[PDB]
Design a protein around this ligand. Structure first.
Ligand SMILES: [N+]
Length: 372
């Protein structure tokens, strides 16, 4: 199994992951993506923050995770009128432009941090529903604390789930991305199957829309037995295992789950470090900590503890002298000639990336390795 040498190092990286996340959590409750990376500093993402919050909730820091959910909830209640206006526009047949949608980046005070024409994404609102329900179930909490923000997110996603948008990586606005569909599905099934939310007006609708998402993925999101990066594509994306665990398009034991884990591993995993997609030129297309953790989580869930452990160890080997985990490492580059221009333009790779730490904690917990 694991010797005292490796257990001590993995425990310390878990302790440090909790510390770096809670040290950089904003006073208002937001988790930032990266406190010192030029292009990300000063902003929060619901994607990063939701997976971060789920690592912290598993770790057992109820107070920290709860302040994140408070933050998100209050940000979303503030958009009640914005969401109602977009729904009324749809009802009039005046479909709003990407420029009018809810944002991707948030400032720590809950304002738009970016222009959605350039980065419109719907996945983070589905990930937040999955996160807050999973947290409340784990710690026995009353979801009425965050219900009015849940209601905004649900209403928005029931309207806009089928809209093309940019993927997790802020690319390809014209497409419908399977890990985006998957994030929405996970959020909708989490609220639709939640006994505390049984009387919500949208209860039945969330499970009917989740079924519509699965129908779309069955028709256009599966090729040669595996999920694909966007509807109508043949290629895989490193984000796709999230459609198994945690978002539940198919269970871990399904043939499409197995075929998707094997395709991601064959096409994108080098020596334990998982690339985003074949064409990735961002910093040369490096190996992403959070994706090695996502694949490891999916292997643990399917009963492949050994494969899970190999990916955990790979991630632990990327910690720097202070125990900080970067976004990505360049040990294998898909497009080595593209790295220099990114380092010149934005600097050295985001380190720490809080989502890297959040995912480390999830995978550690899946393997029973959080300090006792
Ligand atoms: N699991």
């Amino acid at each position: 199994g694991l010797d005292s040498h490796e257990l001590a190092r993995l425990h310390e990286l878990a302790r440090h992951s909790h510390a770096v996340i809670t040290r950089h959590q904003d006073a208002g409750g937001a988790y930032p993506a990266a406190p010192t990376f030029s292009a990300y500093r000063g902003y929060a993402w619901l994607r990063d923050g939701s997976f971060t919050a789920e690592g912290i909730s598993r770790y057992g820091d109820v107070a920290s995770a709860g302040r994140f959910h408070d933050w998100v909830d209050g940000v979303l209640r503030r958009r009640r009128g914005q969401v109602d206006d977009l729904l009324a526009a749809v009802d009039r047949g005046e479909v709003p432009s990407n420029e009018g949608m809810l944002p991707t980046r948030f400032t720590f005070d809950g304002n738009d941090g970016s222009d959605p024409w350039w980065d419109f994404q719907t996945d983070g609102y589905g990930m937040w529903l999955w996160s807050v329900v999973t947290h409340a179930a784990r710690h026995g909490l009353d979801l009425e604390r965050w219900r009015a923000g849940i209601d905004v997110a649900v209403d928005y996603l029931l309207a806009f789930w089928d809209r093309p948008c940019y993927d997790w990586w802020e690319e390809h606005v014209e497409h419908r991305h399977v890990s985006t569909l998957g994030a929405i599905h996970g959020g909708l099934v989490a609220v639709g199957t939640c006994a505390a939310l049984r009387s919500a007006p949208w209860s039945a609708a969330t499970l009917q829309v989740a079924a519509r998402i699965r129908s779309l993925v069955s028709a256009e999101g599966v090729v040669d037995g595996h999920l694909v990066k966007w509807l109508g594509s043949s290629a895989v994306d490193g984000s796709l295992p999230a459609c198994v665990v945690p978002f539940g398009l198919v269970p871990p034991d399904d043939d499409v789950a197995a075929m998707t884990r094997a395709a991601v591993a064959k096409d994108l995993d080098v020596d334990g470090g998982v690339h985003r997609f074949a064409a990735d030129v961002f910093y040369g297309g490096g190996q992403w900590i959070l994706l090695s953790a996502l694949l490891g989580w999916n292997l643990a869930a399917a009963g492949d503890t050994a494969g899970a452990l190999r990916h955990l160890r790979w991630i632990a080997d990327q910690a720097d002298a202070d125990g900080d985990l970067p976004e990505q490492v360049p040990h294998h580059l898909l497009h080595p000639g593209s790295r220099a221009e990114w380092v010149a333009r934005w600097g050295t790779v985001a380190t720490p990336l809080l989502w890297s730490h959040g995912m480390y904690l999830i995978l550690a917990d899946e393997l029973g390795l959080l300090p006792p």
